[PDB]
Write a protein that binds this ligand. Structure first.
Ligand code: HEM
Ligand SMILES: C[C@H](C(=O)O)c1ccc(-c2ccccc2)c(F)c1
Length: 455
């Protein structure tokens, strides 16, 4: 009936995602690019190497577009948003969300507009540290969060506003819980499964409040944010019950956007500054390029990227090098499907090795080294690659891809346009080793001084 790929016999201190990825790569050398692992009677089919990831996620896109159940089901019922939903519900909600994020049905103000404003605020906030040692963790967190608040409720907060601090506190808690290391089984239980449930309840409740206020002034000719756009969809979906668009669904999708769009961006920003401190020659050329293409008066805009190949290679290289989500989020096949000499049954969990693609040693010689030239051709031009999959690939590719690319490019250039980065430790001694984490490559702690730029 099914015939899964071969693998090690069943069941294969604190172990992180990077350790797991390393294990998966070692296993691919034994069993090949496609293999099965079992954790109990639970089989997980692993895809390793670009060719197998492409053939599955891209060439059989639909069949591999399902979401893998995960280490639990969340009776909070997370399955009504985008991240953990499946089927028809996922299909319509993901589509709606993609298009709204691409400026459709959200008013005339652009997404870039919002990101440029936050960029300006991020710079002002960084000026407030008065060039004294700073751990940028918090400030780099507020920026991405505020862009999602602006897109979802049409509101951005001061980084000192309690409401805003509360949302981030809850998000950080859930993220730290969901990404705890393993030791067989996850590692969290103490008093946690309930904090996850409660914090989510709190967040949904906070959003529902905003939803209630939007319903008061809802106007079919004036949506200006994600909530208006969603409420206008429900409107058009009435007389066609049961719709996938409901208040429960709007709040869960809103919660997904916050969770998926805050920490990933924030961690990549923090990792980028750390790689910039570590490689002062790279930073200097980014600053040179910023200086000659944009100058220091006007704010950076997305059109500048095509004229700044070194900086574009640097942003790509940060994402490629750090391998933020080594195994993406788990997938599942949507029906029984023949894949090479195998027969995978509907619902089988599929684990993708993004590390195996981002760190392919033939596409990116010396893949373990940080090097902007992994994205530069032999003439120094920007070189795009089919192996650049930090956002994954296929039908489940990060719905926030465009938004995240804008945040990384605009925030990084804004920061480098206004400040020189000064590391306390001598770069040569600066340790860039990732801290153990269950789902993500996270950078170690560091501080730096944001010194108003000078020459
Ligand atoms: C540097 C930043 C980011 C990176 C590297 C990143 C990466 C990813 C990856 C690897 C996935 C899993 C894809 C899969 O299942 O195969 C994903 C999912 C997703 N991301 Fe992002 N992401 C980032 C930021 C964003 C932003 C800014 C948003 C907000 C709009 C966002 C929203 C989501 C959502 C909602 C999902 C789930 C999509 C689905 O299941 O269909 N992400 N992201
Ligand atoms: C807050 C919410 C939750 O279910 O707890 C939630 C929402 C989205 C993410 C998420 C994180 C990184 C990539 C894709 C999704 C997440 F880790 C947590």
């Amino acid at each position: 009936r099914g015939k899964l790929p071969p693998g090690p016999t069943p069941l294969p201190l604190q172990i992180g995602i990077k350790d797991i990825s390393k294990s998966l790569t070692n296993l691919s050398k034994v069993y090949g690019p496609v293999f099965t692992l079992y954790f109990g009677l639970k089989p997980i089919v692993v895809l390793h190497g670009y060719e197998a990831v492409k053939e599955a996620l891209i060439d059989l896109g639909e069949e591999f577009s399902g979401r893998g159940i995960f280490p639990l089901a969340e009776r909070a019922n997370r399955g009504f948003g985008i991240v953990f939903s499946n089927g028809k519900k996922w299909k319509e909600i993901r589509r709606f969300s993609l298009m709204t994020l691409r400026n459709f049905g959200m008013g005339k103000r652009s997404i870039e507009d919002r990101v440029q404003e936050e960029a300006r605020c991020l710079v002002e906030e960084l000026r407030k540290t008065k060039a004294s040692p700073c751990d940028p963790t918090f400030i780099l967190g507020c920026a991405p969060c505020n862009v999602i608040c602006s897109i979802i409720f049409h509101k951005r907060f001061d980084y000192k506003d309690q409401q805003f601090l509360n949302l981030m506190e809850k998000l950080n808690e859930n993220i730290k819980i969901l990404s705890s290391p393993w030791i067989p089984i996850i590692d969290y239980f103490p008093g946690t499964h309930n904090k996850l449930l409660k914090n989510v309840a709190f967040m949904k409740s906070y959003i529902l409040e905003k939803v209630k206020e939007h319903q008061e002034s809802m106007d079919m000719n004036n949506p200006q944010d994600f909530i208006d756009c969603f409420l206008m969809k429900m409107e058009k979906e009435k007389h066609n019950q049961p719709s996938e668009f409901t208040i429960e669904s709007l709040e869960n999708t809103a919660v997904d956007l916050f969770g998926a769009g805050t920490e990933t961006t924030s961690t990549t920003l923090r990792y980028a500054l750390l790689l910039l401190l570590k490689h002062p020659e790279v930073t200097a050329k980014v600053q040179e390029e910023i200086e000659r293409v944009i100058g220091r008066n006007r704010s950076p805009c997305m059109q500048d990227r095509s004229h700044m190949p070194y900086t574009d290679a640097v942003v790509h290289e940060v994402q490629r090098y750090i391998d933020l989500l080594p195994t993406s989020l788990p997938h599942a096949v949507t029906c029984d499907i023949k894949f090479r000499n195998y027969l995978i049954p509907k619902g089988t969990t599929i684990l993708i090795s993004l590390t195996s693609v981002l760190h392919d040693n033939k596409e990116f010689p010396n893949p373990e080294m940080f090097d902007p030239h992994h994205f530069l051709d032999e003439g120094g031009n920007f070189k795009k690659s089919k192996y650049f999959m930090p956002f994954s690939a296929g039908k489940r590719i990060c719905v926030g891809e465009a938004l995240a690319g804008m945040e990384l490019f605009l925030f990084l250039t804004s920061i480098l346009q206004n400040f020189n980065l000064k590391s306390l430790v001598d770069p040569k001694n600066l340790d860039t080793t990732p801290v153990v984490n269950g789902f993500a490559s996270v950078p170690p702690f560091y501080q730096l001084c944001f010194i108003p730029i000078h020459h």
